[PDB]
Protein backbone atom coordinates (compact mmCIF):
# COMPACT_ATOMS: atom_id res chain seq x y z
CA UNK A 1 0.00 0.00 0.00
CA UNK A 2 1.48 3.25 -1.27
CA UNK A 3 1.05 7.02 -1.18
CA UNK A 4 2.05 9.13 -4.20
CA UNK A 5 1.36 12.84 -3.64
CA UNK A 6 -1.56 11.79 -1.43
CA UNK A 7 -2.96 9.31 -3.97
CA UNK A 8 -3.31 6.36 -1.58
CA UNK A 9 -4.08 2.81 -2.66
CA UNK A 10 -3.04 -0.83 -2.53
CA UNK A 11 -1.44 -2.94 -5.24
CA UNK A 12 1.80 -4.32 -6.64
CA UNK A 13 3.98 -1.84 -8.51
CA UNK A 14 5.86 -2.68 -11.70
CA UNK A 15 8.04 -1.01 -14.31
CA UNK A 16 5.64 0.51 -16.85
CA UNK A 17 5.99 0.70 -20.62
CA UNK A 18 3.43 3.53 -20.80
CA UNK A 19 4.91 6.69 -22.34
CA UNK A 20 3.51 9.46 -20.17
CA UNK A 21 3.75 12.92 -21.63
CA UNK A 22 5.75 15.31 -19.40
CA UNK A 23 2.63 17.01 -18.01
CA UNK A 24 0.88 13.73 -17.12
CA UNK A 25 1.22 12.64 -13.48
CA UNK A 26 -0.85 9.43 -13.34
CA UNK A 27 -2.81 7.11 -15.60
CA UNK A 28 -6.39 5.75 -15.59
CA UNK A 29 -7.94 2.56 -17.18
CA UNK A 30 -11.00 2.07 -19.51
CA UNK A 31 -13.11 2.23 -16.31
CA UNK A 32 -11.38 5.31 -14.79
CA UNK A 33 -9.49 3.13 -12.28
CA UNK A 34 -5.97 4.41 -11.63
CA UNK A 35 -3.65 1.82 -13.20
CA UNK A 36 -0.40 3.81 -13.46
CA UNK A 37 1.42 6.55 -11.58
CA UNK A 38 4.52 8.70 -12.00
CA UNK A 39 6.81 8.43 -8.99
CA UNK A 40 7.32 12.08 -7.89
CA UNK A 41 10.94 11.45 -6.87
CA UNK A 42 12.50 9.57 -9.80
CA UNK A 43 9.72 10.50 -12.30
CA UNK A 44 9.47 6.92 -13.60
CA UNK A 45 6.07 5.49 -14.52
CA UNK A 46 4.88 2.60 -12.34
CA UNK A 47 2.03 0.26 -13.27
CA UNK A 48 -0.40 -0.32 -10.40
CA UNK A 49 -1.80 -3.86 -10.42
Amino acid sequence: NFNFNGLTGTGVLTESNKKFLPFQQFGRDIADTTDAVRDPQTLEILDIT
Partner: antibody
Amino acid sequence: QVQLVESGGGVVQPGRSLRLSCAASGFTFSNYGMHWVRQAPGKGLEWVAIISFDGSNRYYADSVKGRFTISRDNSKNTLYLQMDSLRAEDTAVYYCAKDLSFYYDISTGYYPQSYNSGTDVWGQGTTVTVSS
Amino acid sequence: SYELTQPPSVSVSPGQTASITCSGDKLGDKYACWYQQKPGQSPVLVIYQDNKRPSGIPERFSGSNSGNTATLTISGTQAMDEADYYCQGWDRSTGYYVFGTGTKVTVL
Protein backbone atom coordinates in the same frame (compact mmCIF):
# COMPACT_ATOMS: atom_id res chain seq x y z
CA GLN B 1 27.61 25.87 -8.72
CA VAL B 2 26.38 24.08 -11.92
CA GLN B 3 28.90 21.21 -12.22
CA LEU B 4 29.05 17.60 -13.37
CA VAL B 5 31.55 15.08 -11.98
CA GLU B 6 32.10 11.62 -13.46
CA SER B 7 33.37 8.54 -11.65
CA GLY B 8 34.01 4.86 -12.29
CA GLY B 9 36.92 4.86 -14.72
CA GLY B 10 39.44 2.07 -14.99
CA VAL B 11 41.05 -0.61 -17.15
CA VAL B 12 38.77 -3.37 -18.45
CA GLN B 13 39.53 -6.57 -20.33
CA PRO B 14 37.70 -6.99 -23.67
CA GLY B 15 34.28 -8.59 -23.34
CA ARG B 16 33.76 -7.41 -19.74
CA SER B 17 31.35 -4.74 -18.42
CA LEU B 18 31.68 -1.43 -16.60
CA ARG B 19 29.22 1.16 -15.26
CA LEU B 20 30.05 4.86 -15.12
CA SER B 21 28.34 7.28 -12.74
CA CYS B 22 27.95 11.03 -13.29
CA ALA B 23 26.77 13.15 -10.37
CA ALA B 24 25.07 16.53 -10.79
CA SER B 25 24.76 19.47 -8.41
CA GLY B 26 23.79 23.12 -8.48
CA PHE B 27 20.66 22.65 -10.62
CA THR B 28 17.45 20.63 -10.86
CA PHE B 29 18.77 17.43 -12.41
CA SER B 30 15.25 16.13 -13.06
CA ASN B 31 14.47 19.04 -15.42
CA TYR B 32 17.17 18.38 -18.03
CA GLY B 33 18.04 15.59 -20.40
CA MET B 34 21.56 14.19 -20.28
CA HIS B 35 24.14 13.01 -22.81
CA TRP B 36 27.18 10.75 -22.82
CA VAL B 37 30.03 11.84 -25.10
CA ARG B 38 33.34 9.99 -25.48
CA GLN B 39 36.65 11.07 -27.01
CA ALA B 40 39.09 8.35 -28.01
CA PRO B 41 42.81 9.24 -27.90
CA GLY B 42 43.84 11.30 -30.90
CA LYS B 43 40.31 11.19 -32.35
CA GLY B 44 37.25 13.39 -32.53
CA LEU B 45 34.32 13.36 -30.13
CA GLU B 46 31.56 10.79 -30.61
CA TRP B 47 28.08 10.95 -29.10
CA VAL B 48 27.30 7.86 -27.01
CA ALA B 49 23.71 8.12 -25.80
CA ILE B 50 20.94 10.44 -24.60
CA ILE B 51 18.24 10.04 -21.95
CA SER B 52 15.08 12.09 -21.46
CA PHE B 53 14.35 14.05 -18.30
CA ASP B 54 12.25 11.18 -16.89
CA GLY B 55 14.08 8.31 -18.63
CA SER B 56 11.20 7.33 -20.92
CA ASN B 57 13.07 8.05 -24.19
CA ARG B 58 16.63 6.94 -24.94
CA TYR B 59 18.75 6.91 -28.09
CA TYR B 60 22.16 5.36 -28.76
CA ALA B 61 24.82 5.75 -31.43
CA ASP B 62 25.26 2.96 -33.96
CA SER B 63 28.66 2.06 -32.48
CA VAL B 64 27.17 1.28 -29.04
CA LYS B 65 23.50 0.53 -29.85
CA GLY B 66 22.43 -2.77 -28.31
CA ARG B 67 25.50 -3.02 -26.04
CA PHE B 68 25.24 0.07 -23.84
CA THR B 69 22.31 1.07 -21.63
CA ILE B 70 21.92 4.63 -20.34
CA SER B 71 19.89 5.25 -17.19
CA ARG B 72 19.40 7.89 -14.52
CA ASP B 73 18.10 8.35 -10.98
CA ASN B 74 16.49 11.78 -10.66
CA SER B 75 16.07 11.41 -6.89
CA LYS B 76 19.81 10.91 -6.30
CA ASN B 77 20.79 13.43 -9.02
CA THR B 78 23.01 10.90 -10.79
CA LEU B 79 23.42 9.57 -14.34
CA TYR B 80 24.58 6.06 -15.28
CA LEU B 81 25.87 4.28 -18.38
CA GLN B 82 26.08 0.49 -18.31
CA MET B 83 28.72 -0.71 -20.78
CA ASP B 84 28.68 -4.37 -21.83
CA SER B 85 31.05 -6.28 -24.10
CA LEU B 86 33.74 -3.60 -24.07
CA ARG B 87 35.85 -3.57 -27.24
CA ALA B 88 39.26 -2.14 -28.04
CA GLU B 89 37.73 0.87 -29.80
CA ASP B 90 35.74 1.76 -26.66
CA THR B 91 38.89 3.30 -25.13
CA ALA B 92 37.94 6.95 -24.59
CA VAL B 93 37.35 9.65 -21.98
CA TYR B 94 33.61 9.70 -21.26
CA TYR B 95 31.88 13.00 -20.48
CA CYS B 96 28.35 13.62 -19.23
CA ALA B 97 26.86 16.75 -20.79
CA LYS B 98 23.83 18.79 -19.75
CA ASP B 99 21.44 20.36 -22.25
CA LEU B 100 21.20 24.13 -22.38
CA SER B 101 17.39 23.81 -22.49
CA PHE B 102 15.37 21.82 -19.96
CA TYR B 103 12.58 19.61 -21.27
CA TYR B 104 10.09 20.18 -18.43
CA ASP B 105 10.02 22.14 -15.16
CA ILE B 106 8.97 19.92 -12.25
CA SER B 107 8.72 22.91 -9.91
CA THR B 108 6.16 24.90 -11.94
CA GLY B 109 5.03 22.56 -14.73
CA TYR B 110 6.41 24.84 -17.45
CA TYR B 111 6.53 22.78 -20.67
CA PRO B 112 7.97 25.03 -23.41
CA GLN B 113 7.64 22.46 -26.26
CA SER B 114 10.38 24.41 -28.09
CA TYR B 115 13.96 24.07 -26.92
CA ASN B 116 17.45 25.31 -27.72
CA SER B 117 20.09 22.93 -29.08
CA GLY B 118 23.17 23.70 -26.99
CA THR B 119 24.76 21.62 -24.23
CA ASP B 120 26.23 24.27 -21.95
CA VAL B 121 27.68 22.25 -19.04
CA TRP B 122 30.11 19.34 -19.46
CA GLY B 123 31.70 17.19 -16.79
CA GLN B 124 35.40 16.64 -16.11
CA GLY B 125 35.54 13.22 -17.79
CA THR B 126 36.80 9.83 -16.60
CA THR B 127 39.13 7.74 -18.74
CA VAL B 128 38.22 4.20 -19.81
CA THR B 129 40.74 1.93 -21.54
CA VAL B 130 40.28 -1.55 -23.01
CA SER B 131 43.34 -3.80 -23.22
CA SER B 132 44.91 -6.99 -21.89
CA SER C 1 23.91 6.79 -42.76
CA TYR C 2 25.02 10.30 -41.52
CA GLU C 3 28.39 11.99 -40.71
CA LEU C 4 29.71 15.56 -40.67
CA THR C 5 32.90 16.56 -42.51
CA GLN C 6 35.22 19.38 -41.45
CA PRO C 7 38.68 20.40 -42.65
CA PRO C 8 41.59 18.89 -40.70
CA SER C 9 43.00 22.28 -39.67
CA VAL C 10 42.83 25.99 -40.53
CA SER C 11 45.77 28.39 -40.22
CA VAL C 12 45.15 32.02 -39.23
CA SER C 13 47.19 34.94 -37.86
CA PRO C 14 46.14 37.11 -34.87
CA GLY C 15 43.69 39.80 -35.92
CA GLN C 16 42.85 37.92 -39.11
CA THR C 17 39.39 36.51 -39.74
CA ALA C 18 39.09 32.74 -39.22
CA SER C 19 36.40 30.78 -41.09
CA ILE C 20 35.63 27.37 -39.57
CA THR C 21 33.26 25.22 -41.64
CA CYS C 22 31.19 22.07 -41.10
CA SER C 23 29.21 20.37 -43.85
CA GLY C 24 26.52 17.71 -44.17
CA ASP C 25 23.64 16.68 -46.42
CA LYS C 26 20.94 17.54 -43.84
CA LEU C 27 23.01 19.89 -41.65
CA GLY C 28 21.04 23.03 -42.50
CA ASP C 29 17.65 21.34 -42.00
CA LYS C 30 18.82 20.79 -38.39
CA TYR C 31 20.05 23.13 -35.65
CA ALA C 32 23.86 22.88 -35.53
CA CYS C 33 26.07 23.70 -32.54
CA TRP C 34 29.78 24.30 -31.95
CA TYR C 35 32.05 23.42 -29.02
CA GLN C 36 35.49 24.80 -28.16
CA GLN C 37 37.77 22.11 -26.71
CA LYS C 38 41.14 23.21 -25.38
CA PRO C 39 43.84 20.50 -25.42
CA GLY C 40 43.23 18.20 -22.46
CA GLN C 41 40.10 20.03 -21.24
CA SER C 42 36.42 19.34 -21.74
CA PRO C 43 34.51 21.12 -24.54
CA VAL C 44 32.95 24.53 -23.92
CA LEU C 45 29.83 25.59 -25.81
CA VAL C 46 30.48 28.56 -28.11
CA ILE C 47 27.64 28.64 -30.68
CA TYR C 48 24.20 27.04 -30.63
CA GLN C 49 21.05 27.34 -32.75
CA ASP C 50 23.40 28.19 -35.67
CA ASN C 51 23.85 31.83 -34.62
CA LYS C 52 23.28 32.13 -30.86
CA ARG C 53 25.94 32.86 -28.25
CA PRO C 54 25.93 31.53 -24.65
CA SER C 55 26.09 34.12 -21.89
CA GLY C 56 29.65 35.13 -21.03
CA ILE C 57 31.20 34.06 -24.35
CA PRO C 58 32.94 36.99 -26.12
CA GLU C 59 30.77 38.66 -28.75
CA ARG C 60 33.65 38.25 -31.24
CA PHE C 61 32.52 34.64 -31.71
CA SER C 62 29.87 34.12 -34.39
CA GLY C 63 28.34 31.40 -36.53
CA SER C 64 25.90 30.70 -39.33
CA ASN C 65 24.17 27.84 -41.12
CA SER C 66 22.55 27.42 -44.54
CA GLY C 67 21.83 24.57 -46.93
CA ASN C 68 24.40 21.80 -46.44
CA THR C 69 27.05 23.92 -44.65
CA ALA C 70 27.35 25.26 -41.11
CA THR C 71 30.12 27.76 -40.44
CA LEU C 72 31.57 29.13 -37.23
CA THR C 73 33.38 32.41 -37.87
CA ILE C 74 35.79 34.47 -35.76
CA SER C 75 35.91 38.22 -36.36
CA GLY C 76 39.50 38.44 -35.12
CA THR C 77 41.90 35.78 -33.90
CA GLN C 78 43.45 36.15 -30.44
CA ALA C 79 45.84 34.15 -28.27
CA MET C 80 43.00 32.25 -26.56
CA ASP C 81 41.82 30.60 -29.79
CA GLU C 82 44.39 27.79 -30.00
CA ALA C 83 42.01 24.84 -29.61
CA ASP C 84 39.86 22.29 -31.44
CA TYR C 85 36.34 23.10 -32.67
CA TYR C 86 33.67 20.43 -33.16
CA CYS C 87 30.34 20.75 -34.99
CA GLN C 88 27.21 18.89 -33.88
CA GLY C 89 24.00 18.44 -35.83
CA TRP C 90 21.06 18.56 -33.43
CA ASP C 91 17.49 17.30 -33.73
CA ARG C 92 15.40 16.24 -30.73
CA SER C 93 12.58 14.62 -32.73
CA THR C 94 14.84 12.27 -34.71
CA GLY C 95 17.22 11.67 -31.80
CA TYR C 96 20.10 12.87 -33.99
CA TYR C 97 23.01 14.44 -32.09
CA VAL C 98 26.13 13.24 -33.94
CA PHE C 99 29.38 15.22 -33.79
CA GLY C 100 31.75 16.18 -36.59
CA THR C 101 35.35 15.23 -37.23
CA GLY C 102 36.52 18.54 -35.75
CA THR C 103 39.12 21.00 -36.98
CA LYS C 104 42.27 22.45 -35.42
CA VAL C 105 42.50 26.23 -35.63
CA THR C 106 46.20 27.15 -35.70
CA VAL C 107 47.17 30.61 -34.43
CA LEU C 108 50.44 30.82 -36.36
